[PDB]
């Protein structure tokens, strides 16, 4: 019902991205956690992935489902991408409103050096 | 064919004008649109005028 | 006289009447009158046949009319030349292919049913045959 | 909720004939004085007497005595 | 009669079929709706006319949950 709606919201942009042939940064937010993964244009494989579910990121933070945490995740993924040589991406906000935590993560990524 | 044709003239001072249709009965007020003046090469305001 | 209540279209193309029929078996009744010949039964004809058979069966046992005159046939008025659009719908036909169970009947002895069908048959334009309920 | 579009909503004291004191949030503004409340209302007490079907035989007996 | 009218034929349909090597911009399908959908390296026009966005071979395929005909161009 809700998840389905979110998927519906997301999919138009996703299709467009696919038809561009873009290496997309896919974010996923839950009330408790935030997930980020850079996915190749083929769609079948991911390059780098960072989340608050990971023990390295979680141990540093106070609470995992907050704006600061999101920012941290964004930075982390971006650094990984840089290391892997992934510079240019497209932000797949995945049905979520570009606002608050998502937005924060994106901005952090931008700050780190991901070109989007 | 109740929709009369009108001539949007540039505020830039150039003789350039676009042309278009407008239903004058439902819309008495003048049409203003920011359109590209190809002579100045800028997006300028184009106020409505009579086709004459 | 059977005729469609409503129609999608008032007139219809001539078409062709080739192939074998689909309503081939005695489904509802015990006995049937299967069309051997190819042709087209009008609504009138069908009605006549029904009248013939009901009387024969003396309002005893059920009759089904498996065919329906759903195709309108146009006739151009007399002394009118060949142009000027399609003629008006005069009568309605069911196109009949060989194998068509036309009528079905139950609640009757077999001989009587046969007799009834024979009576009916003379009213119809196509050559026909008596058939029975078959297991499988 | 939205800042300006809504009517004023503040806690008021709703006095009653019961002696019951009821602090409630309302759009009234001033202090409220009630006639009846849920505890007061004759639902449990009234509705038995309020129907009053009775009987004719008893009435007959009462007034004539034979 | 009230019947003698019919419009000029629009010459629609698939113009370039499967395996047919085309130049970019070549119209693959003229159609009314999206009877065929634009896949990889195929653009959709304003009248839903599918055209090649790259040089290569036409590749018709059935894709997606709605089982729709997608035309892609594969590069040679």
């Amino acid at each position: 019902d809700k998840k389905s709606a979110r998927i519906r919201r997301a999919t138009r942009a996703r299709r467009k991205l696919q038809e561009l042939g873009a290496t997309r940064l896919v974010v996923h937010r839950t009330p408790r956690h935030i997930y980020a993964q850079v996915i190749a244009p083929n769609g079948s494989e991911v390059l780098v992935a960072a989340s608050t579910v990971e023990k390295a990121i979680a141990e540093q933070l106070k609470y995992t489902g907050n704006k600061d945490a999101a920012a941290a995740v964004g930075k982390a993924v971006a650094e990984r991408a840089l290391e892997k040589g992934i510079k240019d991406v497209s932000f797949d906000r995945s049905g979520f409103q570009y606002h608050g935590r998502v937005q924060a993560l994106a901005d952090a990524a931008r700050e780190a050096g991901l070109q989007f | 064919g109740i929709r009369e044709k009108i001539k949007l003239v540039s505020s830039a001072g150039t003789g350039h004008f676009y042309t278009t249709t407008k239903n004058k009965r439902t819309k008495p007020e003048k049409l203003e649109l920011k359109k590209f003046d190809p002579v100045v090469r800028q997006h300028v305001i184009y106020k409505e005028a009579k086709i004459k | 006289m059977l005729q469609p209540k409503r129609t999608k279209f008032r007139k219809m193309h001539k078409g062709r009447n080739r192939g074998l029929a689909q309503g081939t078996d005695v489904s509802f009744g015990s006995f049937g009158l299967k069309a051997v010949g190819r042709g087209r039964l009008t609504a009138r004809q069908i009605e006549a046949a029904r009248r013939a058979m009901t009387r024969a069966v003396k309002r005893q046992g059920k009759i089904w009319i498996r065919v329906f005159p759903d195709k309108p046939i146009t006739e151009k008025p007399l002394a009118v030349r060949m142009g000027k659009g399609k003629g008006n719908v005069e009568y309605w036909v069911a196109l009949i292919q060989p194998g068509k169970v036309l009528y079905e009947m139950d609640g009757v002895p077999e001989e009587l049913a046969r007799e009834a069908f024979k009576l009916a048959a003379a009213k119809l334009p196509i050559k026909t045959t008596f058939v029975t309920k078959t297991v499988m | 909720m939205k800042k300006d579009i809504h009517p004023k909503y503040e806690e008021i004291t709703a006095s009653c004939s019961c002696g019951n004191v009821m602090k409630i949030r309302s759009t009234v503004g001033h202090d409220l004085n009630l006639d009846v409340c849920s505890k007061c209302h004759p639902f449990f007490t009234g509705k038995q007497r309020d129907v009053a079907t009775g009987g004719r035989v008893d009435r007959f007996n009462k007034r004539f005595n034979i | 009669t009230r019947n003698g009218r019919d419009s000029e034929a629009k010459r629609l349909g698939v113009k370039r079929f499967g395996g047919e090597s085309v130049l970019a911009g070549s119209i693959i399908v003229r159609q009314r709706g999206t009877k065929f959908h634009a896949g990889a390296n195929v653009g959709c026009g304003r009248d839903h006319t599918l055209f090649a966005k790259a040089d290569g071979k036409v590749k018709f395929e059935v894709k997606g949950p709605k089982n729709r005909k997608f035309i892609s161009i594969e590069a040679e």
Binding site: - | - | - | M1, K2, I5, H6, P7, Y9, A14, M22, I24, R25, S26, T27, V28, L32, L34, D35, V36, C37, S38, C40, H41, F43, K47, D50 | -
Partner: protein
């Protein structure tokens, strides 16, 4: 909020005792209370609708939405998108407060009140009722009002069965029959 507090400790407990529920989340709760004024007389003149809206606002501390015709019907002489009714949806603390008002004050003020309909539940928990007079609420002043009007209250709950909903309402000392 008092009634919410009551629910939190007592009503839930009562429900558990009665239906023998496995989960505490399995218990019914009142999701929303929806107030509506259908105002057909608004097509003749706009001000009546406004007045109705104001009344609604006075009744329940929220500013009402002005609902519009889903489809045009000639039988009532209305076109699509005609401002025909007004509606308030109450949720949370405000809703609770409204509920408290309704039972502790407003229902008692109903003229010739001999109970509420027990067989009025839609079949899946959600209760509905309607008042003939808006003056039963102490928010509306008797002298100020020009036109007599009413409204429908719709108590929507999480209850799967109507019986459960009924039970819940009883647990909140709802009048019934």
């Amino acid at each position: 909020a008092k009634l919410h507090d009551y629910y939190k400790d007592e009503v839930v407990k009562k429900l558990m005792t009665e239906f023998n529920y496995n989960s505490v989340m399995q218990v019914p709760r009142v999701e929303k209370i929806t107030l509506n004024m259908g105002v057909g007389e608004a097509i003749a003149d706009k001000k009546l609708l406004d007045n109705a809206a104001a009344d609604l606002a006075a009744i329940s501390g929220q500013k009402p939405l002005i609902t519009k015709a889903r489809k045009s019907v000639a039988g009532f002489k209305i076109r699509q998108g005609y401002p025909i009714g007004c509606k308030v949806t109450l949720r949370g603390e405000r809703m609770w407060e409204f509920f408290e008002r309704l039972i502790t004050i407003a229902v008692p003020r109903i003229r010739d009140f001999r109970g509420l309909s027990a067989k009025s539940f839609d079949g899946r928990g959600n209760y509905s009722m309607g008042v003939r007079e808006q003056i039963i609420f102490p928010e509306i002043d008797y002298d100020k009002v020009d036109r007599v009007r009413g409204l429908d209250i719709t108590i929507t709950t999480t209850a799967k069965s109507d019986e459960e909903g009924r039970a819940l309402l009883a647990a909140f000392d709802f009048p019934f029959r």
